[PDB]
Amino acid sequence: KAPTLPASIFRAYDIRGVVGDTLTAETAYWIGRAIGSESLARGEPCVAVGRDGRLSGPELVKQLIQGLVDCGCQVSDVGMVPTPVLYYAANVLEGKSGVMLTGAHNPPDYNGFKIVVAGETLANEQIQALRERIEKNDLASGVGSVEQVDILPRYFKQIRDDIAMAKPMKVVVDCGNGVAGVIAPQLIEALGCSVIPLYCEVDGNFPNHHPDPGKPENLKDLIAKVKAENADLGLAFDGDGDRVGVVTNTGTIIYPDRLLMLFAKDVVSRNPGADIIFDVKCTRRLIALISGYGGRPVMWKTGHSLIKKKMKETGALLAGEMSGHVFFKERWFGFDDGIYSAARLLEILSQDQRDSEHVFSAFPSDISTPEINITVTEDSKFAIIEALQRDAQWGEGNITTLDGVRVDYPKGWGLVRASNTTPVLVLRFEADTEEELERIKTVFRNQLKAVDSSLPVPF
Ligand SMILES: [Zn+2]
């Protein structure tokens, strides 16, 4: 009989916890039994399993593997690899299920499970179903097997063979002591670049900055190093390698919507009418740019899981979102991969005589506010958004209510949405001029006040 696990580790799309607290070796075993049971129930006995470079990785992955084996699954054990290399395995090996044991970009003691079953990721009720299986002892029992698989060379060669770099580039590569250190610097060198490594040693203690390029502060060392070495570009991978931060030769941070402008231009050039998915936090310039080149832009809900689901439903060739996940289907498999993104970026930049700063600066840029967060309460957060959706007046503008309220005007846009995990409203504004930016802020400030005249509006 399985033990009692804390419900708190079963999240919307994955499982996550703190080793020694909410996650133990024992937990990993039973999670494997649940995932294996569900995979068999979906007709898939073959499951790939990988882990990142965390201190708890070896111990916990061994239990995860045993739990899968104890259901009767045939496990393909790929060992320590980046998350996207595990995804690669689950696309090229016999089975379509895979489990990645990773705490991603989080502090050292965190770990967790990213799960794909019979070709799809689980969400919401499906992750809760795993929890339920354990609770009720609704688990398969069988005599499975494990095969050690060395997938990294295959992955390396698959990318190297398809990337066609032109001019040599000097690149600072910061892995934040996460698992991308096993391949990113090596692959980037193999493509033709000269690499300046920062924190490329795999060390689960994360003694330098945590591997999270989503926080600019975790790019300070990279920016300084690019400037000091007169490098052409800087890249910072997150801890498991499914995201990469980008810095130009002058230190400018390139956010995902601007990266997507560059990637979209390239993808659409060889694929007339290609669908390109992005989120409601992305610059409006992206919609126009994709359309101008003959693509079909789709502005969608925030969240990499939702973006991916929309990509699959539309047959899109490329997708990305502001938290940093980028998905290529063109020339690739459709899953998010920071290393592949880096390779695709290097390919494009290498074919342009301009420096990376100017390649990116040439795209239209507008005036933008830093993202705004308004602390409210858990009781009011969704209701404020709902009240706006029912009754707000936005004037002449294109209204999008897929995720909060976004309004696109001829000269700019605004967004207000509720955070899904904190009692906070999140806003963004952009416009072609300061005057238009202030006008749009005023529209939103006024609509918020029309919901609750006493709400604290910090803008
Ligand atoms: Zn990640």
UniProtKB/Swiss-Prot annotation:
Checking Pfam families in the record gives: PGM_PMM_I, PGM_PMM_II, PGM_PMM_III, PGM_PMM_IV
The protein, known as? Phosphomannomutase/phosphoglucomutase
- Gene name, Swiss-Prot/TrEMBL: algC
Give the organism the record lists. Answer: Pseudomonas aeruginosa (strain ATCC 15692 / DSM 22644 / CIP 104116 / JCM 14847 / LMG 12228 / 1C / PRS 101 / PAO1)
- Under Enzyme Commission nomenclature, its number is 5.4.2.2, 5.4.2.8
The record lists the lineage as:
Bacteria, Pseudomonadati, Pseudomonadota, Gammaproteobacteria, Pseudomonadales
Q: Name the protein family.
A: Belongs to the phosphohexose mutase family.
Q: Which InterPro entries match?
A: A-D-PHexomutase_a/b/a-I, A-D-PHexomutase_a/b/a-I/II/III, A-D-PHexomutase_a/b/a-II, A-D-PHexomutase_a/b/a-III, A-D-PHexomutase_C, A-D-PHexomutase_C_sf, A-D-PHexomutase_CS, Alpha-D-phosphohexomutase_SF
Span of the signal peptide? none
Q: Which residues carry this modification: Phosphoserine?
A: A104
